[PDB]
Amino acid sequence: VIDFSKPFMSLGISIMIKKPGVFSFLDPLAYEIWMCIVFAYIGV
Amino acid sequence: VIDFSKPFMSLGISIMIKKSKPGVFSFLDPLAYEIWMCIVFAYIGV
Numbered sequence: 001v002i003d004f005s006k007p008f009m010s011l012g013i014s015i016m017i018k019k020p021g022v023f024s025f026l027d028p029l030a031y032e033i034w035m036c037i038v039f040a041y042i043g044v
Numbered sequence: 045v046i047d048f049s050k051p052f053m054s055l056g057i058s059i060m061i062k063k064s065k066p067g068v069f070s071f072l073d074p075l076a077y078e079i080w081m082c083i084v085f086a087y088i089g090v
Contacts, residue, residue, distance in 0.1 A: 006050075006051075007050075007051065010054050
């Protein structure tokens, strides 16, 4: 129904998604493990 | 001089690069350079 010129801009359908602690070296073991390690050290 | 249809394919200028031998001192690669330097400093201070 209307005349289009050549595309002045090209686009497509795209996906938009939403985009270390100081003591993070303790992260491999849980906090309870460290606490029980201290307790076991005292007991030993 | 001629009539073009709408683009059936869109393109542009692009960069093509080739798709690694280990370095001599690549055994230091797991840790950052700043970590090694601070390890030396910490050793001296200790």
